[PDB]
Amino acid sequence: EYIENWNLQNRRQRTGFTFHKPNIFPYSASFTLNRSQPAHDNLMGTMWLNAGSEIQVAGFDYSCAINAPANIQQFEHIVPLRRVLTTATITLLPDAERFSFPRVINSADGATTWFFNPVILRPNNVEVEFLL
Amino acid sequence: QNYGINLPITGSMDIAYALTSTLCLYYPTEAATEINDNSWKDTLSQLFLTKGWPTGSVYFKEYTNIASFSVDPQLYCDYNVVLMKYDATLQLDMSELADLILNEWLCNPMDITLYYYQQTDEANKWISMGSSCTIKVCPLNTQTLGIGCLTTDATTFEEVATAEKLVITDVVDGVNHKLDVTTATCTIRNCKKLGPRENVAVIQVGGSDILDITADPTTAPQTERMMRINWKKWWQVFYTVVDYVDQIIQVMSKRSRSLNSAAFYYRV
Amino acid sequence: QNYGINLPITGSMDITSTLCLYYPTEAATEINDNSWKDTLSQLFLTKGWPTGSVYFKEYTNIASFSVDPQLYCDYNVVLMKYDATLQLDMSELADLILNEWLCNPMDITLYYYQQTDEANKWISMGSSCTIKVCPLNTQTLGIGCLTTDATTFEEVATAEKLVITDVVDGVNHKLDVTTATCTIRNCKKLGPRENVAVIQVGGSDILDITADPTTAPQTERMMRINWKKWWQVFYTVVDYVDQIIQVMSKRSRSLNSAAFYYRV
Amino acid sequence: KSTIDAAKSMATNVMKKFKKSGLANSVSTLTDSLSDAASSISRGSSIRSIGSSASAWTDVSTVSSVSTQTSTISRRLRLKEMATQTEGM
C-alpha cells in the first residue's frame, strides 16, 4: 500500500492510507471556566480530554442551572484537526467515562486547588457537527 | 487589565503547579471581666508572632453586649473571627447576626411613608436595625386593600417584631405590604442576598449548635466557616484558637470582593 | 388495572390538591385575631393554591394531638412547639407520624406476646398508660417477676398519652395494661411515610425517628426554624410553600398502586 | 327547531363557554410557544426538536420513541385546521 501511495503521489493523483484507530488528536488536557470565583464556590465551564483516538468532554455547572435563563445552560466545544479526513465511522456514547468522579485539580492560578463533585445526568439536545 | 467582563480562563493538568495577613477578633466584655487581666493582649500578640504572623497589625475590639454588637456591626479587616456566646433563650439573635455577617447584602433605603413594597426573588429580605424597632405590616391584595387589617388605621397591624435591636424579616411574594414604623430611631432597608461572604467566620462559644443561614425552612445546612467548641474558661478558648490558627486561615480566605482585580462587581 | 402482582418495569434512558396545617392554641392566643386563617388563605391564593382548598384544624397541646393522630390529608405539614421535658413525646410522635404502621390489636389477659424481628414495636395510646412487662423464661417460669404478681413488674411507662415500647425479641413476655384508659396494639413498621412533613419551631433537631442506637438518620422532612412571633413563622411557611411541596410527593398508598398491598 | 320569542343571546352564551374550554387554552399555548421561539435569542439554539431550525411546531415534550414523537406531533398539529394551511376536506 505504501509504495502504491508513493507512486501515485509522484504522479499527482488521489492518495490514501488506511488506518485503524488513527492517532491524530493532539494531547491537550485543558479546562475552561466562565463563571468563576476566587474561592471556587460556584463554577460554570467546560473540561475536556482529547487524547489518542478518543475525545471525552464534560460540561459542568455548580448552580445546576438554577439562576439561568429558563433552566437551560449551553456548552460549546470546537476541536480542529491539522489534516483532513475522509470516510470516517464514529463510535459515540452519551456518558463521560473520566469526568464523573470526585476529583481535585489545581486551578489556572498556578498556586491553588479546587474540588470537583460530579453528579451525572443525561445530556439533552446532543448535537454534533462535522464541518469542512 | 480588562475589568468587569467575565471571560474564559484557559488551564491545564500536565503542568506542575502543586505571611502578610491582618487578623481581627470580636469578643464580649464578660470574657475580659472574667480573665481579671489586661496584659493578655501582649501575650496573644507574642503567641501570634510565634506561629508566624507579624504583630502591630492585629487589632482587638470589644462590645458591651450581643445586642450592642448586633446594631450596626463594623467589619473592616482581612480575616474576621468573632466569638459569640451561646444561650438557650436568644437563638434568633445569634442566627440573624451570623446570617448578616456571613452573606453580602446589596441594600437600598426604604421609605414606608410614601410607597408600598413587594418581593420579586427568594433573596429578598428586609433588615431593620436601630435602638427600638417594631415593624408593623398589613398585607394588601392585588386590589390594594387590607385583608385582616384596615389600611386607614395602623394599630391593627400584625406585628413581626417588638423593640428588637435587629430583626430580619421576609414577606410573602407577589403581594403589596403597607408598613408603619417609628422611623425616628430605626431604619429599614431592602437587601438582596447576592452571594456568600468568606471574610467573616463565627465561632459559637457555647453548647448546642442551632445556627441556620437560609431563609427557606427546607434546608438548614451546617457550613464549615461556622465553628463551635465547648468552654469554661476563656483562656482555654484563646489557646485552642491560636493553636489551630493554621486551620482557621486555610478554611477562610481573602475577601472575594477586594482582590484588587474584581472591580465594578459591587465592591472596589 | 392489574394489581396484587408486581411486574418488571422497563423504560428507555434516552428520550392543585388539599393541604392541611396544624398549630398550637398558644399561637392563636399570641396572635389575637380571628380572620387570620382567611388572610393566609388569600395569600395561598396569591401563591398558587385555589381558594377553598386549604384547611386548618386546631389542637390544645401535643399530648391532646397524640391520641388517634391520624392525618387524612393529601399533603400534611405539622407545626410542633419544642418543650424542655417532652423530648420523648415529640420524638415518638414524629416516629409514628413518619412511618407507615400496620397494627394488630392485642388482648392483654389471654395470650403471651413476643416480637418477630427488629422492625417490630408496640404502639400504645390512651388517656393514661401504665405498661408493665415481665419476660418469662423458656419454661414458663418468671425471672425476677412472678406471673401472678402485680407489683414486681418492671415499670416502663406511666401517665403517657403516647408511648412507643420496644422489648428484647426472641422470648415471650406477659403484659398487664389497664384496658380502660389505654390500649396497646402489635404494630410492624413497613417503610417511610412521606405524606407528613414536620416543621419544628425551636429546639436543636433532636427528634430521633428510630430507636436503634447505632443509627440516627435525620430525615429531610424534619425542618427546624427559630421563632419569636407566630406571624413570622406563618409568613415564612406561606412564602416558601413551593420548597415544602417539592420535598413531599403523592402518598405511596392513596394512588391505585398499593391497592391489595395494605392499601392506605 | 324551537323557534321561540324575540331574539335571545344563544350565540353569546355558547361563545362564553366555547372560549373557556381546552381549544382556547391550546391555541393560546401554541401562540405563546411561537412568540417565545421568535424571542428565543438569549439562549441561542435551545428549543428541543427533532428537525432543524426549531419553529415551535415539532417540539417533543408530551412502546417506540418515534411513535411517541409522532403522537405528540399529531396532537399539536390538530390545530393546523385552525390556521387555514390545509387544502382538502
Major beta sheet summary of chain B: 5 strands, parallel
Number of strands of chain A: 5
Distance between the termini of chain B: 15 Å
Helix segment tally of chain B = 6
Radius of gyration of chain A: 20 Å
- The string of secondary-structure elements of chain A, in order, is HEEEEE
Compute the CA-based radius of gyration of chain B. 22 Å
Estimate percent helicity of chain A. under 10%
Describe the oligomeric state of these chains in a short phrase: part of a larger assembly
Strand-pairing-aware structural class of chain B? alpha/beta
Strand order of the biggest β-sheet of chain A: 1-2-3
Shape of chain A: elongated
Count of runs of 4 or more consecutive helical residues of chain A: 1
Give the SSE string of chain B: EHHEHEHEEEEEEEEEHH
Please tell me what the overall shape of chain B is.
globular
How many β-strand stretches of chain B? 12
Question: How are the strands ordered across the major sheet of chain B?
Answer: 2-1-3-11-12
Keywords (chain B): Calcium, Capsid protein, Disulfide bond, Glycoprotein, Host endoplasmic reticulum, Host-virus interaction, Membrane, Metal-binding, Outer capsid protein, Signal, T=13 icosahedral capsid protein, Transmembrane, Transmembrane helix, Virion
Region (LVD motif) (chain B): 179-181
Protein name (chain B): Outer capsid glycoprotein VP7
Binding site for Ca(2+) 3 (chain B): 119, 170-171, 173, 243
List keywords for this structure.
part of a larger assembly; 4 chains; A: 132 residues; mainly beta; two-stranded antiparallel sheet; 1 helix; 22% strand; D: 89 residues; mainly alpha; host-virus interaction (chain B)
Architecture overview:
This is part of a larger assembly, with 1 copy of chain A (132 residues), 2 copies of chain B and 1 copy of chain D (89 residues). In chain A, β1 (31-35) and β2 (44-51) form a beta hairpin. In chain A, 7% of the residues lie in helices and 22% in strands. With 132 residues, chain A is mainly β. Chain B is an alpha/beta fold and 268 residues long. Chain B has helices spanning 29-35, 40-51, 66-70, 91-102, 234-243, 245-251, and strands at 23-28, 59-63, 79-85, 103-109, 124-133, 136-140, 158-159, 164-169, 176-179, 186-196, 200-205, 227-229. In chain B, the strands form 3 sheets. Chain B has a 5-stranded parallel beta sheet with strand order 2-1-3-11-12. In chain B, strands 4-10-5-8 form a 4-stranded antiparallel beta sheet. Chain B has a 3-stranded antiparallel beta sheet with strand order 7-6-9, with no helix packed on it. The longest helix of chain B has 12 residues, at 40-51. Chain B starts with 22 loop residues before the first strand and ends in a 17-residue tail after the last helix. In chain B, 24% of the residues are buried. Chain D is 44% helix and 0% strand. At the A-D interface, loops of A face loops of D.
